[PDB]
Each structure stands twice: as structure tokens, then as C-alpha cells.
Enzyme design. Sequence first.
Site, short mmCIF file in Angstrom:
data_model
loop_
_atom_site.label_atom_id
_atom_site.label_comp_id
_atom_site.label_asym_id
_atom_site.label_seq_id
_atom_site.Cartn_x
_atom_site.Cartn_y
_atom_site.Cartn_z
CB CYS A 34 -41.34 -58.41 -33.31
SG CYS A 34 -40.13 -57.61 -32.78
N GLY A 54 -37.96 -47.12 -30.44
CA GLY A 54 -36.84 -47.72 -31.23
C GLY A 54 -36.60 -49.42 -31.12
CG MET A 292 -40.96 -30.84 -28.20
SD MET A 292 -41.65 -32.25 -27.43
CE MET A 292 -43.07 -33.00 -28.67
CD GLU A 366 -31.38 -13.52 -38.80
OE1 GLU A 366 -31.45 -14.16 -37.96
OE2 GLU A 366 -31.26 -12.06 -38.75
#
Lengths: 587, 587
Positions: A34, A54, A292, A366
Site C-alpha cells: 500500500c 515501517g 547518530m 582495532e
Amino acid sequence: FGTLLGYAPGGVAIYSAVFRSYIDDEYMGHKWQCVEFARRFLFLNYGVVFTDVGMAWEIFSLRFLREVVNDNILPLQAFPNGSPRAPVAGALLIWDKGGEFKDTGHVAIITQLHGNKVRIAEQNVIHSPLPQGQQWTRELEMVVENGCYTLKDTFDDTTILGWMIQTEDTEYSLPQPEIAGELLKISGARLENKGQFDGKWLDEKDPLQNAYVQANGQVINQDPYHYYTITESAEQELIKATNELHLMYLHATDKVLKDDNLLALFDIPKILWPRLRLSWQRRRHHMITGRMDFCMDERGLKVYEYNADSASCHTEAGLILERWAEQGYKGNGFNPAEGLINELAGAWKHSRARPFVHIMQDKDIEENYHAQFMEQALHQAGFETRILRGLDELGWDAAGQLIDGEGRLVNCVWKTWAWETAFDQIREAAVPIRTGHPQNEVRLIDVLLRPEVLVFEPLWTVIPGNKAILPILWSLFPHHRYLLDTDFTVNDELVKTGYAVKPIAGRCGSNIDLVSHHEEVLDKTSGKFAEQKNIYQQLWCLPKVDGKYIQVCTFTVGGNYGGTCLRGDESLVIKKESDIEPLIVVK
Amino acid sequence: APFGTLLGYAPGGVAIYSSDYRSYIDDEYMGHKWQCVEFARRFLFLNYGVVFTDVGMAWEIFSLRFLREVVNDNILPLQAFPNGSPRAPVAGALLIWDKGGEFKDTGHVAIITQLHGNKVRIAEQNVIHSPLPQGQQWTRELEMVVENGCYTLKDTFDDTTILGWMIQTEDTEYSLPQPEIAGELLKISGARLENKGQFDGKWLDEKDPLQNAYVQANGQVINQDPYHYYTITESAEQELIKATNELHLMYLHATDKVLKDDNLLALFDIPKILWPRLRLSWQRRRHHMITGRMDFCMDERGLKVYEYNADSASCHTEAGLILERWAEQGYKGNGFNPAEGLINELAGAWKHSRARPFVHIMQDKDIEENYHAQFMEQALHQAGFETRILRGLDELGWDAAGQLIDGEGRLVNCVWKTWAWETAFDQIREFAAVPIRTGHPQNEVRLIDVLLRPEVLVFEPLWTVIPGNKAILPILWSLFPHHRYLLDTDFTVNDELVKTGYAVKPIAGRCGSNIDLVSHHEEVLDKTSGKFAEQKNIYQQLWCLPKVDGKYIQVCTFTVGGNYGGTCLRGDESLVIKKESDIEPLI
Ligand SMILES: Nc1ncnc2c1ncn2[C@@H]1O[C@H](COP(=O)(O)OP(=O)(O)NP(=O)(O)O)[C@@H](O)[C@H]1O
Ligand SMILES: Nc1ncnc2c1ncn2[C@@H]1O[C@H](COP(=O)(O)OP(=O)(O)NP(=O)(O)O)[C@@H](O)[C@H]1O
Ligand SMILES: [Mg+2]
Ligand SMILES: [Mg+2]
Ligand SMILES: [Mg+2]
Ligand SMILES: [Mg+2]
């Protein structure tokens, strides 16, 4: 599946991973739900699109549509079913999740209003060819009583939320849904100690995990029996915020690259300006991943920064924490970052990157596992890599071309190096790059800025990763709920609230100074960027939970949410040495 | 070194190939492999995001007064300094050579890569064709002599002439005036052929379908006296080419500015519903325009442009083929047909258009449009396309689902229209998206039901309506005040236009319909009826066509893929050229 059933007004087809639906390089949706129809409809007819969501019902919560041709942001008002505001053609119509629309919810387009009815066009309700030339899928009874307008759905167990209109006029419209403070609280939890992390719980059979050990040992944080959780309502707020601020950051990036006065504030070498612009204009859709930084607690959700250039923690949140779970979590919750590898693999599969990409990391044990974590994604997307550890395997042929060790050409690379580093090498009459050298001494800037090389992340990504953009974001979205007032000085309002002093191009938590609304220096860190331009961002201390300050991190993979992870520290300022704290989402 | 071999890189990594005998970078045309201009222009674009127009000879660059910022089609000023000027030849500037000596008639250009107080280093492409010293980012060094404020460069050659250098700056000090052409060179002369009966019977080859197409429409005839012709000097053509390329870039800049501001776009009377698409079109189909035609007044007074037919223009067959036949048939002089390669350059622009394999040609049922369709069919065919001409709309119909199909049932997905967009816009002036049919009882497809079908890729692109609409004239005037070639055009009869007298003209008309030529004496020099009486007019400074050998001659230049495509004439017993005005042979 896919059978053409007919067309909405204007000629918008209606049908019934490799299902991504694009029009140009703009993501319309997933075939053929949709949301994909409503987005495409809006994209082909008005040149606008709403952010990723979502469930369809999540749409009714947006308050802005993006105008593609100029990355411009428009106001979108929401209206409840039963409103003085009439549901005009072309408006978005949303259903809450419920009944016929169990969990998804639903969305369609109103193609035509009447006196007692309304016609809507939509996908995933009708899976049968429509009658010749009919440009609508359903009709809905409308009740116009006392100036108020109500729609009645053809189903008997579905709630209709309302319609939406792109307009500045806020009349009759409802406010932006604000989430409950309690649902946003982070809280501690504990596993039952049955000696689950007493040994080699990290699978040393996996090369990736083993590289992690080599750099950190069998450790995630001090106490692996303790973890934290967030309600599934928070993760949704985190998804709303991530996707929304992602667009904001780009809307400001475009704004920056459109005015020499704004760009001038980032202290990038004025020689890279035309290249910033060109990169923005042709690689706008090529960003791959980002992180973020958020403060999340009962006060609400705030953004500190968007590490869009070169982020990390992917391995931790998307691999190690998984092992931790598989090793000691017997609950119902889940790791909000479980599918990061795939998300990434996805972003790579659709990135115009070359078949063979060179991975450029620093010679730091690292970074090894980080480079390899990403190499997993590239390999899953079908690319060929070659992990370059340092600039020594690099060289030039006689003509001046960049070849790697094996002697092959290096025309596509994913770096771990931050762009500002190559920038440094410049700050010493057009991008000065070497194209040949007596000793074959190739430098970082001699690769990343070699016009012929395709770099990831793109060059423009350094605009949103630079704090000089924070004051701009404030300027454009004043008093936005996720934003913090930040300026290039300590103004009246900041002096009053307290603030964080931050170097525009810093990282790792370096040279950060925290001053209260009083005078005191709540906390301070050292660093190598004590000599660059600082910004002052309204203070907003991290929440202390179970003896540790905690900052929430989400990831952006190709513009959209990619997961969440936690970072804890005994002090207010998260640093490179901070621990990764297992997180488990619960409902 | 063979052809195409890489010898080295200029500053910033701009490669330099050997041109021991065409290049694009994305969608931007750079030059021809591997001329001195191809490198000059590529340097600037990769390093500075700007570029200069298509020039015939490298020496012509020195006459250009503006650069183009690609990332926003904005126009920057570019001054020219003589060799011997106070203005120092800073790095990055353009160094132009005048034709002469070592650089015979082609002329030459290069980039200054660095200054040394007594010397200068430059990079170029068509001078040396051998690898360069490992790492050396320059091809030659010139002796710069600085005597009392002035700067002089000495070229390593003994017979060549250096015009000077150019710098994109707003400071006009020390700079040169943009050259003007001696009006005497712009005069159109009358000529005659010796009558030995070359045009008495059937001189047009009727076995050539194209020519026959022309004849079924006009007979064995071009004008009333096939023995008389006109001429212009090769210098006037150079001017005409200069102006065509410049105005093309101008109109395109004016288009960008219009589609960036609602208050402007609104002056065009284009149905609002189409706005979002107009914009979307400018953005994608930016370089998809095939061919246009400019109308000029040329004579001792100089060069003025009346309009730019960019939507649908004709006269291509007349100029590029029939006149070719005329010459090949009755001319034996030294001059030439300024339009001779249309078909070839036509195939060119098609080969490089993002055109689909099978293209439906759409013309109207006019025995006169037949050869303009077929002529265009040849270029498509030569560029390697499959075509099928559609005369009228009876042959169009829809599938059971609603897809556009032609007579033989195939899908109509791509189209070269003869029709003017306004015709389709008209079918809108009679909703919540463009009102098109995707089905209909009688299977009756309208014009608009094809051109505005989202999946249908049309030529010319939608946006071309803007430059083709005369509401753009005032805009163009506003942006480029008293521009060398522009004429004072406004939406009202302002003071100044009252003084000169002006042309009243509909914004969306053609064929010379409803035109009113009023004098400064305020008299109606001439009028023409039409079907556009009722639309918005613009009023343009009067500037009557010159009368030569009994007729008024208007010059026309074809634009093709943005660059000059040839010239042709049109004469008439009146100051107003119309669809019936004949074509006059030019040489
Ligand atoms: N406005 C603020 N109020 C309170 N604490 C802040 C604020 N800004 C930053 N901090 C703290 O300082 C740390 C460093 O700031 P941040 O904006 O993430 O800069 P960074 O060095 O670029 N981050 P990173 O690249 O992850 O290492 C954060 O992780 C917070 O704990
Ligand atoms: N400013 C002006 N001064 C004097 N004559 C003019 C002027 N503008 C136009 N004309 C004359 O009017 C004719 C028609 O104007 P033009 O601008 O070509 O309009 P049109 O009808 O859109 N052209 P077209 O599409 O070729 O048929 C020209 O060919 C000239 O002969
Ligand atoms: Mg941070
Ligand atoms: Mg940071
Ligand atoms: Mg005309
Ligand atoms: Mg016209």
C-alpha cells in the site's frame, strides 16, 4: 503478482529485496504494498515523497513531505476522521492498524470527493483487474453533517485515522503526536549467572569474531551479565527520529552547498568547494552507513551529532552483541541491530560502486575487524575486495595510475579514514595530489581525491558530519523537538541553560567541555582538536542508569534506520574507550 | 604514443592523452578526443565545476565572456586580458592562442598550472604526444617577462600569436571589451545564378522518398525565383554560431530560474497541475533536447533574437536537404550550404539521447508534416532506431489493462512529437492529477493521453515549453539587461517601448499569428490574424527585418543538442514572417 490491474489518476499503475521499486534513484517502496503506491502516486503527480516507515499507520504521524527536485521540505497536516477540514482529492488517507489491517495499518489516495461518497485509489486491497478505464479501487460513504466530514470504510473492523494535506494552514489539524516520557526510559536488567560468560564465549572459529578478540579480548563491557532494555515503543520513536533527522541533515547539507556564506563556516579548504557540490549532485544517493548519537530519557529524545563520514560500532552492535545474546539471553526481547550486516549488504547491492572495491583501513588492529565486518557486507553483495592496511601496498605505474599490491588498479574504495584527515594534508593551487613519485610514496589524499576513484562514503558526507551544520539545523528547524540549540558562540539562551563546547571536526569525545547554567565545568576531555573552531550546543546530560551514563546510538544504512546500540561511560562524555552495553528491545 | 594513450596528469589529477588521431564526463560534453579544448574544458569541470560553450576553433574561446557552473546552471563572468596586461596570469586561468603560425587556423588553448616570477607552467593536450616525466604535472614552460607592472608571456614557438589569458572574476579592471563584429560583415547580399535551365523541369529527385514527400506537399519548388539566392560572410556565420550557442545557454539559465520560482512560472499560463512535472522534467531530461530554431534579425545594426522555437520547430528538411539539392543542382560557386550536415548532426544528438530502441513518430495529418517526420525518421534510422510514423491519433488504442498501443498492437513507450505541447495543455484547460485517459469505450486516445502518460518518454522534453513560451522574453531581459542580442520585452508597454515601437505577441503562439507591429509614431505597421488572440501577450521592442532584393529576410539557426546546427533564411513581402513565407537559398 505484478499483474497490472489499472491506473490511478494521472496514470499511476496499480499492481497485486529484489522487490525494491524505484523511479530514477528514488525509493518508492516494496513491491507491491500500500505504501509503495501512495509514495509513487505522490512522486509522479506532485514531485513529493514521505520518509521511510515501517507500518503504513506510521504515516499519519509525519508532518512533512520532501520535494525531490530541490531537497526542499514541505508541511503536511494531519486530520482526524470527522473533521471540518474536508478530504480533498490527492490527499493521503491512513488507517490505523486494526481489523482487516491487523498490524500494518493502511494507506490509499483519495482520487475524488463527492456529496455523499469519495473515491480512493490504493494497492493491496484489490488484487483483480479493474473495469476498463476506471481509476479508483473503492468508494467510501462520506457523511457531511454540520460542516463536519466523516468517512465510513467498507470493512466492519477497521479504524480510519484520517486524511492529510500538504499545507501551511494548521486549522482544524491536529498536533504532532508526542511520545510518553515513561515509554522512553532506559532501565537495567540481569541475566541469571550460570557462568555463561566465564571463558571463550566468543566463537573463535569465526575470523571476524576472532579479529575482535585480538583487539579487545573476550570482552564487551565490565559486567556481561547485566544489560539494558528499551520498550518496543522507544525503538519506534528511534526509527521515527533517525529517518526524520536523516532528511533534515541532508536538507541542511543541500542548503549549505547552496550558499558560500554557510559553506564558509566549515573550514574545509576552499579548493574542495566545487568538488563538494559536484559530489553532492551525483552521489547524493550513494551514502552507505552512518551513526547518530542520542540522549534518551523521560525528557524526550535529543541529537548530539550525526557521524555520517566514517562511523563504527557496527561490528559490536551487529555481531558481538548477537553472540552475547545467543550465549546468554533466554528472554523474548531482541537485539535492535541484529540485521545490520544484511541492511548494509543491501545498501551495497544498490550502490553504483565498482565490482572490485579496495578497503582502506589504517594499520590499527582495532580497525581490522571493522574493515572485515564491512567486507562481509560487500562480499554478500557480490563485490570483490582487497583490504589495504596502510598506504604501503599502494603505488603508481609510469603514466601515473594508482595500482595496489597485486598490481591492479584501485578505482573504487570504502575507507575507514575520515575525510578531514585527507583534508589536513591539503592544509599545507588546485587539489595538490601526487600522480607519481621517485620512491612511490602514495598518500591518503593521493587516493581519495584522485578524480578517477569512486569513494564511499561520498565526499559531501563530511558536511553533515561537521558540527558547523548543527547551528544551521537549528536555524532551519527552530525549536524542533529533537534538536538542541547550538550556536558558534554562547548566546543568552545558552548561557542560561548550560552548554557543551565542541570542536566542529572532532571525534572520539575529544576536546569537549561541559559548562553548567552556572559557571562550573561539569566535565572536560583532552584531544587533538583543541585548535579548531568550536560550536556550543545546549547542555543536556546523559541519563545515569545503574552506575553509568548512557547514550543511545542508531545506525543509518542508506538513509534509513539500521539498528540501535548502547554506549556507556562512568562520565558524562562518551569516549572511544567507552563500553558497548548489550541492549534488548521488549514489548 | 598511439591515440588515446595516457601521458600524464595536470594538477588535481586531470589526465592528458595523446591525440595522434568524443569525450563526456557523466552527462557533460567535454570535447573531442583529444583536442586542446577537450582538455581545457575538462580541467575546469573536474576542478571547478564550470565549463565554457561549444566553440568551433580553440582561438574562439578568447571571445567568450562567461563560464557555466554546471551544478546549478548558473552563469559566471569571465574577463579577457591581453598578453601584456597589468593583470597577472594566475594559475588556473585559461591561456588562449590566436590562430597563426604553429597553430595555423585552429588556434589553441591551455591551462596555467603555476607561476614563477620569471616563468609560467602550462598543461594542454594537442601539442606534444609523448609520455611526460614521471610525476611532472605540466607540458611546457613559458618565459614571463615583468616590466613596470605589465606581464608578457613568450611562447616557445617563433611564429605563433598569444591572445592572452582569462579569469573568472567580477573585477573588469585591466580587461578587454567583448569584441563586436563590423556591421558590414553582417549584411545579407543578393546573388543570382546563370540561367541555363537548371530549375525548369524536375530537379528534385523523385525516387528519394523524402524529396518526393516534399513535392507531394509543395511540388518541384522552393520559392518564386530558384535562380536568385542570398549570401552572408563566413564571419557572419561565425557570429551567428557564437550567438546561437550563447543564447541557448541563456534561455536554459532563464528556464532554470523560472522553475525555481513560482512567481515567475506563473506568468506562463501553464495549468498548475503540470508544475511538479515541469520541474521533474527539467531535472531528468536536462540534456535530452534534440533540436530547436532561433529567429534573428541580422544586418549592419547587429544581431537580435525574436524567439527560440524549442518545443517543435520545422524548416529542417528545407534547409538541410532541399537547399542541398538546390545547390548540388544550380550552384557552382565557392560558398556552401550552412545547413548541409543537419541530418548527420541530427543522428548525432539521437545517438546520444537516452532514447529507447523503438520510437514512435507522432505527426498530425498534414501532407506538409510528412517530410518533416520522415526527414527526422532518417536521423533516427541513422542513429540506429526503429520507427513507425503515426499520422493523427486513430491508430492509437488501449490494452484491456490500459496500456498505450499502436496499430500493430505494439506498446507506445517512446515518442518524437511534431505536435506542440500547448496543444496538449489545451486539452487540460477543458481534478487531482493530470486528467488523462487510461481507458475509453470507443478506444478514443487523445494527444494528451499519450504525451503525459508517465511511462511514455517524449521528445522534446516537457520543460522545453518554458523556453518556447515568450513569457520567457521579459525574464531573459531581466536577467541579461541590454544584452548584446536581446530585445526589450515586457508584459506592458512601458515608457521605453513606447519610444521604440514594439511587437505585440502571444506568449504561446506560432506561425506569426496575431502579431501587431506598432511604431514609435504609434502606427500599426502590420498585423496578422490568428487563433491566439485571446491569450497573454508580451510586447517586444520593434526591430524590423531588413529588406533585401524585394523581400524581407529573417535568419534562422538550428539548435541541435544545444549547439549550432546550421542556418537558413525566410523572406516575405511583409515585415512579418509567417508559415507561408518561403525559404530562400543561403550560401
Ligand atoms: N550538548 C551536550 N550535552 C551533554 N553532553 C553532551 C553534549 N554534546 C556532547 N555531549 C557528550 O559528549 C560526548 C561527545 O560529543 P559528540 O557530539 O558525540 O562528539 P564526537 O567526539 O564527534 N563523537 P564520536 O565521533 O562518537 O566519538 C557525547 O557522547 C556525550 O556524552
Ligand atoms: N520585436 C520585433 N520587431 C519587428 N518584427 C518582429 C519582432 N518580433 C517578431 N517580428 C516579426 O514577426 C514574425 C513573427 O514573430 P516570431 O517571434 O517569429 O513569432 P512566432 O509566430 O512564434 N514564430 P514561428 O513559431 O516561427 O512561426 C517574425 O518572424 C518577424 O518577421
Ligand atoms: Mg558521539
Ligand atoms: Mg562525532
Ligand atoms: Mg518565428
Ligand atoms: Mg514560435
